[PDB]
Design a protein around this ligand. Structure first.
Ligand SMILES: O=C(NCc1ccc(Cl)cc1)c1ccccc1[SeH]
Ligand SMILES: O=C(NCc1ccc(Cl)cc1)c1ccccc1[SeH]
Ligand SMILES: [Zn+2]
Ligand SMILES: [Zn+2]
Lengths: 153, 153
C-alpha cells in the first residue's frame, strides 16, 4: 500500500491533516482526515498543480489538470484530475473528510505527490454555475489553507 | 529543467525558501535559496525520509537513507542520500544557501520529491564525532525548520 499525507495551514484559523491511501496500484484512493476552523457548510476541496507555497496558497497555481479538461464535480466525466468536490463543516467548524476517488492516483500518470491540497472559502459549484469562472474553479473562492502532499510513514 | 521548491517553517523564527533544479535527468542538482533567523555559524542541512509534518518536523523521520548507509558529509562515499552537509549563517542570521549535489535527484528511483528538507540547530559533524549519534544524525541537534519538497513551475 501507498500512504501519503498533507498538513493544511493558512493565514486564518483553518488547519487540518488529510491522509491518502491507495491499496491497489491503479485503484481508488481513500482520502480522509479532519479540518477545523471552517465556516459551517460546503468548502471546495482540490488538488492544485504546484507544490509551491512560496507566496502562500496562491503559488499552488490552478486545479491539477493534466488532461486539459473543464472543471467538474468528482463524479463528472468532464473534470480536472484535482477536482475532489466539497467537504462539509459542521456547526463547530469541523469537517470530517472522507472521500474515495478513482481519478487521482498515488502512482503512475496522475500522481498527486508533491502537489498542493487546498480547502477553499465557499462551495464548489461543480461546474454548474453557468459562468466562465464555474468551469475553471467552480466559484470556490479564496484558498483558506493548503499543504504540499508528501510521502507518509 | 525540472524545478522543485521547499518552504521551511518551524516553531522558532527560522524560515526560508529553497529551490532545487536539475538540468539533466541523472545529472547534478543545484540547491539554492535563503534562510533567515538562524544563529551565526554552521547548520546541518538534510533531506529527511517523510513528507510528513503531522507532528511538526519530528514526523519527517530520519535522514533519507534508501541505500542503508551511515551518516556522512556530502563529499563522502559513505553517506545518506539526504546528507547535504552544512549551510552557513552570517552575522545577521541569514544563510545564502548554494549547493550542488549529485546523489540526490529530482527524477529516478530515489527522488526527493514529496520528502522533507530540514535545517538543524547546530553544525553537522559529517559523521566524525566518534559517537553513535554522529553516524546517524551528525549531531546536528534539533529541527529548526522544515518543509515538504514540492513541484514548482
Ligand atoms: O512515485 C513517486 N515517488 C516514489 C514514492 C511514492 C510514494 C511512496 Cl509512499 C514512496 C515512494 C512520485 C514522485 C513524484 C511525483 C509522483 C510520484 Se508517484
Ligand atoms: O519522476 C517520477 N514520477 C513522475 C514525476 C516526474 C517528474 C516530476 Cl517533476 C514529478 C513527478 C518518479 C517516479 C519514481 C520515483 C521517483 C520519482 Se521522482
Ligand atoms: Zn477543477
Ligand atoms: Zn545523514
Amino acid at each position: 500500500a501507498t500512504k501519503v499525507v498533507c498538513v493544511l495551514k493558512g493565514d486564518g484559523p483553518v488547519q487540518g491533516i488529510i491522509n491518502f491511501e491507495q491499496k491497489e496500484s491503479n485503484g481508488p484512493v481513500k482520502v480522509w482526515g479532519s479540518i477545523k476552523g471552517l465556516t459551517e457548510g460546503l468548502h471546495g476541496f482540490h488538488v492544485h498543480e504546484f507544490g509551491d507555497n512560496t507566496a502562500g496558497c496562491t503559488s499552488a497555481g490552478p486545479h491539477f489538470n493534466p488532461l486539459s479538461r473543464k472543471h467538474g464535480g468528482p463524479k463528472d466525466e468532464e473534470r480536472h484530475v484535482g477536482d475532489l468536490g466539497n467537504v462539509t463543516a459542521d456547526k463547530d467548524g469541523v469537517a470530517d473528510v472522507s472521500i474515495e476517488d478513482s481519478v487521482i492516483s498515488l502512482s503512475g500518470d496522475h500522481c498527486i505527490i508533491g502537489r498542493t491540497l487546498v480547502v477553499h472559502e465557499k462551495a464548489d459549484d461543480l461546474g454548474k454555475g453557468g459562468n466562465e469562472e464555474s468551469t475553471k474553479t467552480g466559484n470556490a473562492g479564496s484558498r483558506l489553507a493548503c499543504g504540499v502532499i508528501g510521502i507518509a510513514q
